[PDB]
Amino acid sequence: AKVRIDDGGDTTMLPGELVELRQVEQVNEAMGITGSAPARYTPVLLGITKASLNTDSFISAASFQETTRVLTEAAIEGKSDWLRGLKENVIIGRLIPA
């Protein structure tokens, strides 16, 4: 699913960041409506452990594996968990969204 960023022109995507290809295409179209220089990318293939740790939710990645490193990068990046998935609502105590 993901892609790796290089040539970070006019975009808030520094090189080395793993973004989904649909999101890079949406940003490229919604900035190509302004006639700007888009961002290049090269596709990558992740394993089932690296793709589990590179998700948008720090609660699921902390409950899966390597809790100290995930919580350290989540605390420095200042990220939010919008509770979108089965594993977060089980920890919270809510109805799962499936």
């Binding site: 520094l14 090189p15 080395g16 720090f58 609660i59 902390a62 409950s63 809790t67 100290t68 490193r69 919580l71 350290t72 989540a74 605390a75 420095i76 990046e77 200042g78 990220k79 939010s80 968990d81 919008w82 509770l83 594993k87 089980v90 920890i91």
Partner: protein, 615 residues
């Protein structure tokens, strides 16, 4: 309450002090832990300033002060004017937290000794150099002014620093050691200036240097978006966990059972108070320097034991469990208490086979069923006017009565029950059943659901769970009941199928046997005539039997459609012969009759299918 998202960040010293400080009506804050005492040995009460203090954390008993004089419930929201303990319910010791004010700055071990070690990334230094500065083994140059041999962030030994003191150069050269030097290096780093310098440096640089510049720039850009200071990675205030999450209970025998977090906090407080004592009386710097290094090693062992240096051990050289050790593993908080729990209204027993019992039905033992359905029985015993409260209902339940068994029989009717066998490898390891009360002690399982559980009757046990809510009973019936779980979810193939004795019984019933040929070759007028001849004792089970059967949906082994021979009859009638059929048809446009060679056991099998399906 409800909330929409959870946000994590780095805690500032003012935020840590905001968690711990609580003000009094007299105008005094009470949140700081100053003594390493826990409770008094004579009377088992917490000490007035310590890790269990009632002024900071709350009262140990409901609506009762520490010194006495406020034992009643009527004083609510009041603070005792003599002792200082707020007269509140005693469950605030789960939530109320305190703090420790340190005498020297300390580094958080998560930001120093991790990977990729964000402290050395932001400071643009090597990890061994920052680890040498923090633990008081080398100096660092904070002011390189008026020197050609000295530069910024340059490390010096003690010999190199005392030989710099030969020149007294002839200006102000500053050095630093410990986490004070790291805090001073982080406090003077202009984030926007270093960010625009890195953006001006990436466009004209080499290949392998550019990845390091990208990593430092993406670390620096997080500190500007989060509006957090870089010096917050060094701690001035340490938060203290509530005392009910580090309990100290007494066992029957007089010995106290403590948690490992109290020893680590005790070491931190002891070394902090000794450091304040040494700085008060102006001790030599080799003694104050060893005390700061020991406080630094004490804070690191409380957070992550054994991450950097020697692992702090206990009584039998067992390592003490720390704040990251209680959450980080498969015995931590996530995998043992949040993603899986122990539940009420559950039990287990060994399983036996359940023939002469339907599917969607499990045999539930009676003494197991009075325990699992106890509040439903208690509700029915009061609704029927037998008893009037829960105490009489519990007394009649435990004393044994024949009324209780009829009450339980009419209670468990229509209440589905979930059965589970470990390991639960796929979805069919938990299925719902309608229980019937059996006598004995084992659970009776239907033999067709046994490949779905991978369960045989040589020692397997199964857990039993009772849904309580009405939405939970409607979900066990409409989504999880065992008569709706025929197909596998991995393939499209049926899981519920005969196996291991029904397969052999249906193979023997429909096989060929040349020895058992009694009444072979006889003609019968349909299926019911041969079925009556079998129950009368006229034919064997594997006799070759001609059956008048006008239908054409006949499937055989190696199916035949070619004619073997033909015998012509009168009146324009042709007798067509097949391998296992004999068809007599008309001249132009009709079929008259048809005979099929079969066994009576095949007739029994097809009658079973036909009365099972068409109903």
């Amino acid at each position: 309450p409800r909330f929409d998202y959870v946000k994590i960040a780095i805690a500032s010293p003012e935020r840590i002090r905001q968690w711990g400080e609580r003000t009094l009506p007299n105008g005094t804050v009470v949140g700081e832990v100053t003594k390493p005492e826990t409770i008094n040995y004579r009377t088992l009460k917490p000490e007035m300033d310590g890790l269990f203090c009632e002024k900071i954390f709350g009262p140990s008993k409901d609506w009762e002060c520490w010194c006495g004089k406020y034992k009643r419930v009527r004083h609510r929201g009041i603070v005792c004017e003599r002792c200082g303990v707020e007269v509140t319910e005693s469950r605030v010791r789960r939530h109320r937290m305190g703090y420790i004010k340190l005498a020297a700055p300390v580094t958080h071990v998560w930001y120093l000794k991790g990977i990729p070690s964000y402290l050395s990334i932001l400071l643009d230094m090597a990890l061994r150099d920052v680890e040498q500065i923090v633990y008081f083994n080398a100096y660092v140059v904070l002011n390189p002014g008026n020197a050609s041999n000295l530069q910024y962030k340059q490390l010096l030994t003690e010999d190199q620093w005392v030989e710099i003191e030969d020149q007294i150069e002839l200006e102000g050269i500053e050095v630093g050691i410990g986490a004070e030097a790291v805090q001073r290096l982080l406090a003077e780093l202009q984030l926007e200036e270093v960010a625009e310098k890195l953006r001006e440096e990436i466009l004209a640089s080499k290949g392998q240097k550019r990845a390091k510049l990208i990593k430092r720039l993406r670390v620096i850009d997080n500190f500007i978006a989060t509006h957090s200071q870089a010096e917050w990675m060094t701690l001035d205030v340490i938060p203290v966990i509530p005392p009910d999450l580090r309990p100290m209970v007494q066992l029957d025998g007089g010995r106290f059972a403590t948690s490992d977090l109290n020893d680590l906090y005790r070491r931190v407080i002891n070394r902090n108070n000794r450091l304040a004592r040494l700085q008060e009386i102006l001790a030599p710097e080799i003694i104050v320097r060893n005390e700061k290094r020991m406080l630094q090693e004490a804070v690191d062992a409380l957070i992550d034991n054994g991450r950097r240096g020697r692992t702090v051990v206990g009584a039998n050289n067992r390592a003490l469990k720390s704040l990251s050790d209680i959450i980080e593993g498969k015995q931590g908080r996530f995998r043992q208490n949040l993603l899986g729990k122990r539940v009420d209204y559950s039990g287990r027993s060994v399983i036996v086979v359940g023939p002469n019992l339907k599917i969607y039905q499990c045999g539930l033992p009676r003494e197991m069923a009075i325990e699992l359905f106890q509040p439903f029985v208690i509700h029915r015993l009061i609704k029927l006017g037998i008893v009037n409260n829960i105490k009489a209902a519990k007394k009649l339940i435990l004393k044994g009565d024949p009324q209780i068994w009829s009450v339980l029989e009419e209670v468990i009717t229509g209440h589905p029950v979930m059965l589970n066998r470990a390991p639960t490898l796929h979805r069919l390891g938990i299925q719902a059943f309608e229980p019937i009360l059996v006598e004995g002690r084992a659970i009776q399982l239907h033999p067709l659901v046994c490949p779905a559980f991978n369960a045989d009757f040589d020692g397997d046990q199964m857990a039993v769970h009772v849904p309580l809510s009405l939405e939970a009973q409607c979900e066990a019936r409409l989504l999880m009941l065992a008569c709706h779980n025929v197909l596998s979810p991995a393939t499209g193939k049926p899981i519920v199928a005969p196996s291991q004795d029904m397969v052999l019984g249906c193979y023997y019933l429909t096989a060929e046997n040349p020895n058992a040929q009694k009444g072979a070759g006889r003609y019968f007028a349909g299926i019911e005539d041969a079925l009556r001849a079998y129950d009368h004792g006229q034919v064997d089970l594997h006799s070759q039997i001609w059956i008048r059967h006008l239908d054409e949906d006949v499937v055989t082994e190696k199916p035949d459609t070619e004619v073997i021979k033909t015998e012509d009859l009168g009146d324009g009638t042709v007798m067509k012969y097949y391998r296992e059929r004999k068809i007599r048809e008309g001249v132009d446009g009709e079929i008259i009759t048809q005979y099929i060679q079969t066994t009576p056991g095949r007739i029994i099998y097809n009658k079973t299918i036909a009365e099972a399906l068409v109903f």
